Amino acid sequence: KATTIKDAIRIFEERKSVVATEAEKVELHGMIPPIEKMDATLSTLKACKHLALSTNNIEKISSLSGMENLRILSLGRNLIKKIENLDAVADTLEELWISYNQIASLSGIEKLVNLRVLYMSNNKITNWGEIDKLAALDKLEDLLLAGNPLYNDYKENNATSEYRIEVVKRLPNLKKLDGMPVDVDEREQANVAR
Structure with missing residues (x-):
């Protein structure tokens, strides 16, 4: 019943009139019935730089081998709980878009050594020890944490400004946070405290 990767690729090729093995952006989002599993058919997407698997029912990151040029992995609005199984794309992955999932731990993110952008609004991060893992x-x-419990804690206390300084204390070279540039004043506040 769930849409397979193979079937989603066929839907994409018919909608976009392209050969998916040659496409830089492969759009597999919002399938009906939702995709539930990544699988080995992704290995056919040899040209893919931006894989959009958002808005499905995926529970596990898997099956990323064979996409040798992947730069953007887009998995927002799924059912993912864990950052894992990314070794095959660590050498090229620059952006992970995974907002609106159920991730409570950032363990495993440290394998994405080339990551420049992490969008993970509306996940389940509750505490600063998880953010510490991003320092590596x-x-x-560019980092998005809005809507995680940790962010909401500060917003509930009208202290989002203090949350931003705490992020930059841990991530001194961050340039943009929650869609807003890190201001020089924020960097200096983090410095004079760090």
Whole structure:
């Protein structure tokens, strides 16, 4: 019943009139019935730079081998709980878009050594120890955490400004946070405290 990767690719090729093995952006989002599993058919997407698997029912990241040029992995609005099984794309992946999932731990994110952009609004991160795990990512410049419990804690206390300083204290070279540039004043506040 669930849409398979093979079937979603066929739907995409018919909608976009392209050969999916040659496409840079492969649009597999919002299938009806939803996709539930990533699988080995993804290995056929040899040209893919942006894989859009958002708005499905995927529970597990898997099956990313064979996409040698993948830059953007888009998995927002699924049922994912864990960052894992990304080794096959770590050498090229620059952006992980995974907002509106159920991720409570950032363990595993450290394998994405080339990551520049992490969009993960509306997940289940509750505490600063998870954010500390992002400090290893030397190229991370754009981060979205809005809607996670940790973010909401500060918003509930009208202290989002304080939350932003705490992020930049941990991530000193971050350039953009929750869609808003890190202001020089925020960087200096984080510095004079760090």
